[PDB]
Amino acid sequence: SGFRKMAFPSGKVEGCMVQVTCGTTTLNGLWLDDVVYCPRHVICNPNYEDLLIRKSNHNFLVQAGNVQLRVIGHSMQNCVLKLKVDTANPKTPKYKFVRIQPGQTFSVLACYNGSPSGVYQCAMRPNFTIKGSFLNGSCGSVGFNIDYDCVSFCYMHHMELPTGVHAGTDLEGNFYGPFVDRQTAQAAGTDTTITVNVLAWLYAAVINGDRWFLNRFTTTLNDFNLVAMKYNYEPLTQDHVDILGPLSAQTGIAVLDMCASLKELLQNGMNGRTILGSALLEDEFTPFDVVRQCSGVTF
Amino acid sequence: SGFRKMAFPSGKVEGCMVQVTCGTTTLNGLWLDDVVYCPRHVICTSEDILNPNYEDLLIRKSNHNFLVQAGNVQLRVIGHSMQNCVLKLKVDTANPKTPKYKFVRIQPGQTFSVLACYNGSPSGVYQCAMRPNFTIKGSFLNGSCGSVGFNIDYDCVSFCYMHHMELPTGVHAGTDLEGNFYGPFVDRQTAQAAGTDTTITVNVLAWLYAAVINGDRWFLNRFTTTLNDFNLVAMKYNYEPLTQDHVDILGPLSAQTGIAVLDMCASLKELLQNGMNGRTILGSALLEDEFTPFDVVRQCSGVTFQ
Ligand SMILES: *C(=N)[C@H](C[C@@H]1CCNC1=O)NC(=O)[C@@H]1[C@@H]2[C@H](CN1C(=O)[C@@H](NC(=O)C(F)(F)F)C(C)(C)C)C2(C)C
Ligand SMILES: *C(=N)[C@H](C[C@@H]1CCNC1=O)NC(=O)[C@@H]1[C@@H]2[C@H](CN1C(=O)[C@@H](NC(=O)C(F)(F)F)C(C)(C)C)C2(C)C
């Protein structure tokens, strides 16, 4: 037993990380087959479309470990630059590019000079930011899920907002949230709590013998969602209640039963108690995360 | 900016994990050059685990009683030897993916990454601390035994923990990679309970310095303290004594923030006296003790946000 904020094994992604230099700008690239993907801001209100067509190939210094890759082509896709190189990455995993929804979780491999430094677990916030841990040179660091042996890349890191939270794109260069890759004034919107994830975490508490917060009462979506949006919680939809099904049977607490416990916790707080060693309601574990860690699924 | 329970990238440990089978017992092993290291209780059956005589169970085994599997490849065992509570299986192939490594015994308070494994396949990576009472708060199911804890320093992997068992309080016990248990535990299903746990004071102070570095000062006060007055108060909250070594180790974080270690001790003292006042620090409503001074310096700017 035990419950931990657990990342995916980073091995397969570690094999894809390289260093990209264009002038004084250094950051991280993802080398898949014969293409390196990185933030287009490496070339730097700029003018990218124009800037890149001007720039020749030997201007992009691409270092993989000690080796250098020769760039035989460039091209823009939204906010990501694609650098064509002479050689396919022999360590290339089975992979795809996915776009995740807010509330969905993923593992970040934090990198500096194409060198992996750390791995942590993240949720795409409702306001399309992530609460990451990123310094200078972190740009091009990626977010991923692993499904059997297939790496789904969902995030590339671009920037830090003034509140200390982070913004990036999918691997096709589409931003998460209403942001731009320009030195301009940008803020995170007001965030909400991922209700379905809090409930999933309460089910993990129960599975691990942490049960003081349960009660006799049940509720309805309406009454709950009226209390929720008061405490800046996402609406719990009927889809959410379906996903929690597995955990509701496996424990014998009913989702609208668990909604009554969570209501009670929002109104009365914790009474100097913890749940799985937290004094806050944790919203960065999906139902899938909880079933996977409490089942022991491997990669 | 930001502050996360970061683990080390697991790739270099992933390439070492194998599955070890003895009769009906399968657990994970660690394949480094031509040796596979695993918990010796792989040779135990259901009837052995209360008073196993390992020397006696082992003398009754051939090399070919050990099935070792690295992905699809069954490796061939050519030698076996017990060292403390680890079995070492000599195999015909040296692991081509063996990293630069060493084995280290860590002290309570020290952190490391755990690669949770089942059937020699990795399930996930998380960060742990050796609790003062020599346990870890892991996430570990049936078959997780042989999973390892590690730090990475440039390219070199220091193996510090191997998982053996779960104690009645839901917390975990294991050995160094020389097979010597952390704490007063034994690889037997006999009555075993963890010492009462304590908060790792030096680590909480480190994490308060992290909070100042990311620009949060709401919990500082204008007081100082003697180390001894601080320790007299800290013991009353089940905090580990802070020693002069601990104060020395905090020197750098003190210099980066301009806040004296004993002034940070005055803040912690007040935080214990009052709690959070419905406020949080680095996203936690509790005082965090699983970040070392080395961790904070590693993950934090080097330039304080004010
Ligand atoms: C990539 N290597 C860095 C990562 C940053 C640095 C501090 N922590 C991080 O996550 N990315 C950048 O430097 C990007 C890059 C220009 C400016 N920038 C920022 O992150 C800046 N923020 C913003 O521009 C703002 F306000 F809009 F969010 C900075 C002020 C340096 C934090 C570009 C092209 C956006
Ligand atoms: C390794 N595969 C397991 C790991 C355990 C299983 C559940 N969670 C874990 O981390 N190791 C064992 O099953 C060891 C093994 C015999 C018994 N054992 C235990 O962990 C048991 N606990 C104890 O014996 C206790 F509490 F006294 F320390 C168990 C009750 C099954 C969790 C041996 C030889 C110690």
Side-chain angles (χ1 to χ4, degrees):
Chain A
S1 69
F3 204 74
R4 276 276 181 176
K5 212 152 202 284
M6 189 174 277
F8 290 99
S10 45
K12 289 148 131 69
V13 178
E14 282 166 59
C16 305
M17 293 313 298
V18 304
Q19 191 189 207
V20 176
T21 315
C22 183
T24 55
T25 319
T26 275
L27 46 68
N28 302 288
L30 183 76
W31 178 23
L32 300 168
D33 304 298
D34 60 334
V35 188
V36 173
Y37 301 75
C38 68
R40 77 174 171 186
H41 82 237
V42 65
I43 72 191
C44 287
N45 214 327
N47 182 2
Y48 296 111
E49 146 179 7
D50 200 24
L51 293 173
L52 171 57
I53 214 78
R54 294 178 188 282
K55 297 272 298 211
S56 82
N57 279 354
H58 273 192
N59 303 148
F60 296 97
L61 300 98
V62 178
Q63 204 103 60
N66 289 341
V67 173
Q68 242 167 14
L69 306 191
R70 229 176 41 73
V71 181
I72 59 153
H74 41 55
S75 57
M76 291 258 291
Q77 207 204 358
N78 308 291
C79 297
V80 302
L81 174 73
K82 297 165 149 164
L83 301 178
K84 180 100 141 161
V85 295
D86 53 358
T87 186
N89 184 354
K91 296 209 247 57
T92 298
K94 218 219 173 304
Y95 82 88
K96 56 182 163 87
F97 300 167
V98 306
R99 179 147 187 115
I100 48 152
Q101 299 304 135
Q104 282 191 304
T105 53
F106 60 96
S107 302
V108 165
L109 190 63
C111 298
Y112 302 86
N113 309 103
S115 202
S117 93
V119 65
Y120 55 94
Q121 192 73 1
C122 264
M124 181 63 68
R125 303 301 317 163
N127 70 354
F128 285 107
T129 64
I130 74 170
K131 307 191 135 287
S133 187
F134 289 125
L135 304 187
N136 299 326
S138 58
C139 288
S141 298
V142 292
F144 67 93
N145 291 269
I146 303 181
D147 159 49
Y148 315 99
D149 56 346
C150 178
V151 186
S152 291
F153 301 103
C154 57
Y155 181 82
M156 172 167 278
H157 181 53
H158 289 246
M159 43 183 291
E160 189 170 286
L161 299 158
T163 50
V165 305
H166 299 106
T169 66
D170 65 22
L171 267 282
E172 280 164 38
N174 309 123
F175 256 95
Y176 292 97
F179 305 117
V180 306
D181 62 0
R182 290 182 16 240
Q183 191 73 95
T184 189
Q186 316 191 62
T190 57
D191 207 14
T192 55
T193 294
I194 317 152
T195 315
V196 56
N197 286 9
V198 177
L199 288 159
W201 174 76
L202 286 184
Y203 277 113
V206 164
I207 286 168
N208 274 271
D210 224 342
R211 305 184 55 106
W212 64 260
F213 52 82
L214 300 174
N215 58 18
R216 52 157 36 76
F217 307 111
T218 53
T219 193
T220 60
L221 280 180
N222 299 257
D223 311 62
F224 176 71
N225 278 310
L226 284 164
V227 170
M229 85 171 287
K230 243 172 232 186
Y231 282 91
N232 254 348
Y233 269 54
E234 287 294 286
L236 193 76
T237 71
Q238 176 55 39
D239 171 41
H240 292 157
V241 180
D242 310 336
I243 297 152
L244 288 168
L247 292 163
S248 177
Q250 196 212 293
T251 71
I253 303 81
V255 181
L256 285 177
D257 203 347
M258 199 63 88
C259 301
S261 302
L262 178 51
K263 182 177 324 196
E264 207 179 66
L265 284 167
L266 267 36
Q267 281 154 358
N268 310 122
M270 295 247 191
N271 312 327
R273 308 164 136 292
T274 63
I275 303 173
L276 291 170
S278 184
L280 299 168
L281 292 184
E282 267 282 339
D283 77 336
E284 296 230 341
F285 295 95
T286 71
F288 285 56
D289 293 338
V290 169
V291 170
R292 194 170 41 260
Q293 171 162 183
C294 300
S295 282
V297 176
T298 53
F299 306 102
Chain B
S1 182
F3 207 74
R4 279 283 183 184
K5 199 100 71 180
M6 212 163 284
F8 288 96
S10 64
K12 286 190 171 63
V13 180
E14 279 169 63
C16 297
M17 295 313 299
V18 297
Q19 181 179 238
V20 181
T21 305
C22 212
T24 42
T25 309
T26 316
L27 39 69
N28 315 270
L30 176 72
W31 183 24
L32 312 164
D33 309 295
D34 70 323
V35 186
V36 168
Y37 305 76
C38 65
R40 72 175 174 173
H41 81 253
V42 77
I43 76 188
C44 295
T45 57
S46 39
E47 293 184 355
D48 283 303
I49 42 147
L50 246 163
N51 288 284
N53 186 325
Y54 285 109
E55 293 87 358
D56 189 72
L57 284 167
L58 186 57
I59 195 81
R60 302 175 194 262
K61 299 293 174 190
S62 64
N63 294 330
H64 70 264
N65 296 133
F66 303 109
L67 305 166
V68 180
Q69 222 192 310
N72 277 23
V73 182
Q74 78 149 15
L75 296 168
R76 178 176 122 84
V77 176
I78 59 159
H80 66 263
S81 101
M82 188 159 60
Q83 177 189 8
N84 300 305
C85 306
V86 311
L87 182 62
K88 301 192 285 211
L89 302 172
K90 183 132 52 224
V91 293
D92 249 346
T93 325
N95 183 3
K97 300 185 250 164
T98 299
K100 179 62 175 172
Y101 73 100
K102 56 182 161 297
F103 297 168
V104 184
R105 209 192 160 71
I106 57 165
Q107 308 301 305
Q110 181 63 242
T111 57
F112 54 91
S113 301
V114 165
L115 186 65
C117 289
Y118 302 94
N119 297 121
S121 296
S123 172
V125 64
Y126 53 93
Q127 189 75 342
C128 280
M130 180 68 58
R131 302 312 310 172
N133 73 352
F134 284 106
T135 54
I136 74 171
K137 296 183 194 199
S139 180
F140 283 131
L141 309 184
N142 292 329
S144 59
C145 283
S147 291
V148 293
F150 58 96
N151 289 276
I152 310 200
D153 319 283
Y154 306 87
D155 60 320
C156 180
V157 179
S158 59
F159 293 103
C160 63
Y161 178 87
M162 171 172 277
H163 188 49
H164 286 242
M165 58 190 324
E166 189 167 312
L167 294 159
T169 39
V171 300
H172 298 103
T175 68
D176 65 34
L177 268 291
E178 292 157 281
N180 293 117
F181 261 88
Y182 292 103
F185 310 101
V186 293
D187 47 355
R188 317 160 41 200
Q189 177 134 33
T190 200
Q192 266 175 117
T196 47
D197 208 18
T198 54
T199 304
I200 307 148
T201 310
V202 58
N203 286 359
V204 174
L205 288 171
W207 173 82
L208 290 181
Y209 279 114
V212 172
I213 288 167
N214 287 49
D216 189 2
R217 290 175 68 99
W218 73 250
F219 45 87
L220 294 189
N221 69 29
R222 60 179 219 290
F223 295 105
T224 194
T225 184
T226 73
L227 189 50
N228 193 58
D229 276 356
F230 172 78
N231 280 331
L232 282 169
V233 176
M235 76 193 294
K236 282 162 207 188
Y237 291 92
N238 260 19
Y239 275 52
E240 281 291 284
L242 193 75
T243 75
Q244 182 58 48
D245 288 57
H246 294 163
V247 165
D248 295 327
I249 284 149
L250 286 166
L253 286 165
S254 187
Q256 190 184 155
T257 56
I259 304 167
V261 173
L262 281 174
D263 298 352
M264 200 50 102
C265 289
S267 308
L268 172 45
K269 194 195 290 191
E270 174 168 294
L271 272 168
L272 289 172
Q273 178 198 239
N274 300 348
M276 292 271 160
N277 194 14
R279 254 176 314 240
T280 70
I281 300 174
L282 297 170
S284 181
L286 281 173
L287 297 165
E288 293 287 319
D289 76 349
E290 293 204 353
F291 301 99
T292 70
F294 187 108
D295 296 342
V296 171
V297 167
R298 187 173 189 285
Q299 157 160 201
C300 288
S301 178
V303 181
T304 185
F305 177 66
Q306 151 259 352

